[PDB]
Design a binder for this molecule. Structure first.
Ligand SMILES: Nc1nc2c(ncn2[C@@H]2O[C@H](COP(=O)(O)OP(=O)(O)NP(=O)(O)O)[C@@H](O)[C@H]2O)c(=O)[nH]1
Ligand SMILES: [Cl-]
Ligand SMILES: [Cl-]
Ligand SMILES: [Cl-]
Ligand SMILES: [Mg+2]
Ligand SMILES: [Zn+2]
Ligand SMILES: [Zn+2]
Lengths: 134, 166
């Protein structure tokens, strides 16, 4: 079929079905935003399979149909303030509130990088990417 | 951190993607975008332990490509829609495929009945409970629209993988 296998940041992947006329950006917007990723923080590459390099950067507005049959990869731009969380168990002796549900938080979990504090039953609502501008 | 490789299987349109995206992004996708191949990674805290869920969202329309991801998978969410008896019976075919690639009757699985928000129910809870009882696996009622039981479905499958590892 007229599909493209695109490897995504953080060891993820998707297979998009190219509609005639769509750009790489049009085909990959939903796959990135559903995974909590911003297209402005990413670049799209063509995986090279010869001795020259490992991949070559492509313009986001490139016609996707012209790359049918090639393997692509989307990576974070250089040094974007996006990383993965570092969760840790944490008992709040002093009164605290959950960042997800705003209720009382006695025994919760806190990310040691961004400070996101939450109940265990609220962890799935924590955003996938950890924003670190420290 | 322990990584759990999860695979979501089921007939086309039962809500495999809507359940996964509701877990990852906390948003309900109300459009029909038939999946070809989609993998997701997300940290979740389950019973005090943080773990990384590597979820493979598969195609209900089957675009032999299943066997490869069925061999490497650690747990499976066999999903059907409570308003689609055909998908409820299709569950048997998916468990047959998984057992054919795992070479064991003891595979971590969780039967998931989705679309519980709809009043046009054709598969009642007793039926799915009996089917899950027949397979020796848990059963979870979910609704990706209301997020009901979405966490409960994935939390249960992880616990099935933990006890399967002894
Ligand atoms: N009311 C309701 N609609 C749902 C629910 N889950 C999914 N849907 C609807 O079901 C349709 C198909 O959902 P989708 O997640 O794409 O299903 P799928 O099982 O992944 N399909 P496919 O196999 O093709 O990839 C969409 O219109 C979606 O909004 C639910 O719990 N309640
Ligand atoms: Cl890079
Ligand atoms: Cl919601
Ligand atoms: Cl992550
Ligand atoms: Mg789908
Ligand atoms: Zn964080
Ligand atoms: Zn909370």
């Amino acid at each position: 079929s007229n599909t493209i296998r695109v490897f995504l940041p953080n060891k993820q992947r998707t297979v998009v079905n190219v509609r005639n006329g769509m750009s790489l950006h049009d085909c990959l917007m939903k796959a990135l935003k559903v995974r909590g990723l911003q297209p402005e923080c990413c670049a799209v590459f063509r995986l090279l399979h010869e001795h020259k390099g490992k991949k070559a950067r492509l313009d986001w507005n490139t016609d996707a149909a012209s790359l049918i049959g090639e393997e692509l990869q989307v990576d974070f731009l250089d040094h974007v303030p996006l990383t993965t969380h570092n969760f840790a168990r944490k008992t709040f002796l002093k009164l605290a509130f959950c960042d997800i549900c705003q209720k009382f938080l006695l025994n919760g979990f806190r990310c040691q990088t961004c400070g996101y504090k939450f109940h265990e039953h609220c962890s799935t609502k924590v955003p996938t990417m950890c924003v670190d501008w420290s | 951190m322990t990584e759990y490789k999860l695979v979501v299987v089921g007939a086309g349109g039962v809500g495999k993607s809507a359940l996964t995206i509701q877990l990852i992004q906390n948003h309900f996708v109300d459009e029909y975008d038939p999946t070809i191949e989609d993998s997701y990674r997300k940290q979740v805290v389950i019973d005090g332990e943080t773990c990384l869920l590597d979820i493979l969202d598969t195609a209900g329309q089957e675009e032999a490509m299943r066997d490869q991801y069925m061999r490497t998978g650690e747990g499976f969410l066999c999903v059907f829609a409570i308003n689609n008896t055909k998908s409820f019976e299709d569950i048997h075919h998916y468990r047959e495929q998984i057992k054919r690639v795992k070479d064991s009757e003891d595979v971590p699985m969780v039967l998931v009945g989705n679309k519980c928000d709809l009043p046009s129910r054709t598969v009642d809870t007793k039926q799915a409970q009996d089917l899950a009882r027949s397979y020796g696996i848990p059963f979870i009622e979910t609704s990706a629209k209301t997020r009901q039981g979405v966490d409960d479905a994935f939390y249960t499958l992880v616990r099935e993988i933990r006890k399967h590892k002894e």
